[PDB]
Amino acid sequence: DYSLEIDAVMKAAQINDTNNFVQALMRWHFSKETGSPFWLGMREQLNFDPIKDVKTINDLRQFSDISHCLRQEPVANLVPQGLPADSHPQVYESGGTTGAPKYVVAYDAWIEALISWRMSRPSGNTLAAIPTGPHIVGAINKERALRLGGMFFSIDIDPRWVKRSLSEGDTATVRKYTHHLVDQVQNTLMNQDIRFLVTTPPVLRELLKRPEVVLQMKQSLAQITLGGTELNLDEIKFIASEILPDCEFSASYGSTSALGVSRSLLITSESQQVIYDSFSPFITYDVVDSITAQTVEYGERGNVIVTHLSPWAFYPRVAERDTAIRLPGVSGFAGDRLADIEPLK
Amino acid sequence: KDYSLEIDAVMKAAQINDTNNFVQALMRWHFSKETGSPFWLGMREQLNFDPIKDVKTINDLRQFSDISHCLRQEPVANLVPQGLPADSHPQVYESGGTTGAPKYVVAYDAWIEALISWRMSRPSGNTLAAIPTGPHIVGAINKERALRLGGMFFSIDIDPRWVKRSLSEGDTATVRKYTHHLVDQVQNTLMNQDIRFLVTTPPVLRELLKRPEVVLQMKQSLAQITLGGTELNLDEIKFIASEILPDCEFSASYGSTSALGVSRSLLITSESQQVIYDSFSPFITYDVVDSITAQTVEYGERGNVIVTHLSPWAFYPRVAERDTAIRLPGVSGFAGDRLADIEPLK
Secondary structure, three states: OOHHHHHHHHHHHHOOOHHHHHHHHHHHHHOOOOOOHHHHHHHHHOOOOOOOOOOOOHHHHHOOOOHHHHHOOOHHHHOOOOOOOOOOOEEEEEOOOOOOOEEEEEOHHHHHHHHHHHHOOOOOEEEEOOOOOOOHHHHHHHHHHHHOOOOEEEOOOOHHHHHHHHOOOOHHHHHHHHHHHHHHHHHHHHHOOEEEEEEOHHHHHHHOOOHHHHHHHHHHOOEEEEEOOOOOHHHHHHHHHHHOOOOEEEEEEEEHHHOEEEEEOOOOOOOOOOEEEOOOOOEEEEEEOOOOOOEOOOOOEEEEEEEEEOOOOEEEEEEEEEEEEEEOOOOOOOOOEEEEEEEOO | OOOHHHHHHHHHHHHOOOHHHHHHHHHHHHHOOOOOOHHHHHHHHHOOOOOOOOOOOOHHHHHOOOOHHHHHOOOHHHHOOOOOOOOOOEEEEEEOOOOOOOEEEEEEHHHHHHHHHHHOOOOOOEEEEOOOOOOOHHHHHHHHHHHHOOOOEEEOOOOHHHHHHHHHOOOHHHHHHHHHHHHHHHHHHHHHOOEEEEEEOHHHHHHHOOOHHHHHHHHHHOOEEEEEOOOOOHHHHHHHHHHHOOOOEEEEEEEEHHHOEEEEEOOOOOOOOOOEEEOOOOOEEEEEEOOOOOOEOOOOOEEEEEEEEEOOOOEEEEEEEEEEEEEEOOOOOOOOOEEEEEEEOO
16 A cells, blocks of 8 residues: 555655656555556666655656657556556557557546646536547546536547548548538537537537527537647637527547646636646646757747656656647646647648 | 346346346336336336336346337436446447437446456457447447456447448448448557457458458467457358467357347357357347247347346346347256357348
């Protein structure tokens, strides 16, 4: 039982004592008693001592991205021994397009913590027009739908097929697929009482072209969440002021890599950027030059780098496929904020 | 206000096959103002019979009609019996999108747990269930199974509504490309992670078997394959079982959202002459009836499949499924028929 070791970590996180948070978690991840087989075995490959040479969150820059290992690392090797036996490990995936994907493990207690943080009033049912299956977004949105006093409704949506279909410029399929998505979404909006919608711009765009659906949304929806990295802020502002005046808008930024999502500020008439905040110190961002990997200045755009550190997992310095404008983090908190995320070309 | 004892009493009656007291107790449950669902509470007054006084046995449920149409716009909260505890965890699942869309039902963790302890009744490891998740209860049922097998639950992106849409526009080129895309995700997992159990469908297996490196991996690591759906080809399965995957066991799964469950077949071997299924009786019961008279057929005759779900969680009587099957004797002491060689109607 390592419930005291664990709770001491969470208490360091809570008071933002990030140095002790980091050091306590280095000891956790690299003890023979509590660490995961994967990090225990990785320790000999490192050019420094994770226990002697890591004092702060910046010291984590000594680690390389090990995402490339997560194809063939057996998933059970990702589990820290120190976790309780009822922790409930679950496989989730991102990648690859062509052959991949990377396999990570999340736990209920983690998704629970993440949603607590996110969630700190309307109530009702949620329609998440998002991937489930191997995609952690699916499980994160279930847990949020549960905090919202309703049921979790979803659709069939094969995001890999949509990716693959673009990479082949078969945009005839892509049109037809989105169409089928939107039909699913219409069905539930019409037939059941949905308070909360979670979707993407292309899907919402085509929904707003179906006027009966539009009328239902005027009556029922208290909030729309938009996900992804292809958000047109002007389009959203308009939708919000002219078309769905009673519905709140916000954005969600997915990182499977950090086992998480990040929340935007509410999107108002006043919004100059979409600006995202992370579950720091568990999930932290850095925004870096694409050649030097050095942190850019505030207001500059660089490559997004995400680090997960927690009792459940350790994924240091993950190089995402996105860029953002670097903003100062919430004060007393490790990590940067992001604005206006874009995909890399 | 707490109904733990009542619920337990029902479970106990099912446990010991006291089917009469099980049915009678669940009529009270479902039709009492205190414990029943708003949906059946509201339906009571259009029945031509008293579900409480005029129903004694399973066969007596024949007096109910299939209400499956109401489930498209019945608000889902209305399906929730008021007597369930507050921790119960209602979840929505769907059947019948693809022209036209979908019945919404509710299911609960404790129900799915009971169903899997039934189904589950040496090898252990990871499961790859190459099957729908999302709004589909089969995903959630397979997740709980995988949990009990001592490994993790791996899954894929698969949109069965897309597949049926395409198929009905007779667009076979899209069907094919999509199947290839499913097979790629399955191969990736089978090649990169150690998978002990595979849950899939014949079209997909059929293509996996066209990939010699994949077959070699399977020969090495697969303790069991489960095939779903209603287009099973016994002879082909027996071939793969004996000549291709000799150290792998094969079974079938027959799902219906209508009954919030799956039924399970006997191991398919060299000796099998039929694919034969049994159900989680008395919660899920089958009848096999004439297409015109709706009367039960003789053992060994083909008829239309009727499924009944009866539990503390739900009540779906006499659902007319879109499949036929050979009617077989049930397990002795159990209400309901066993089924063999399921086919879709048309």
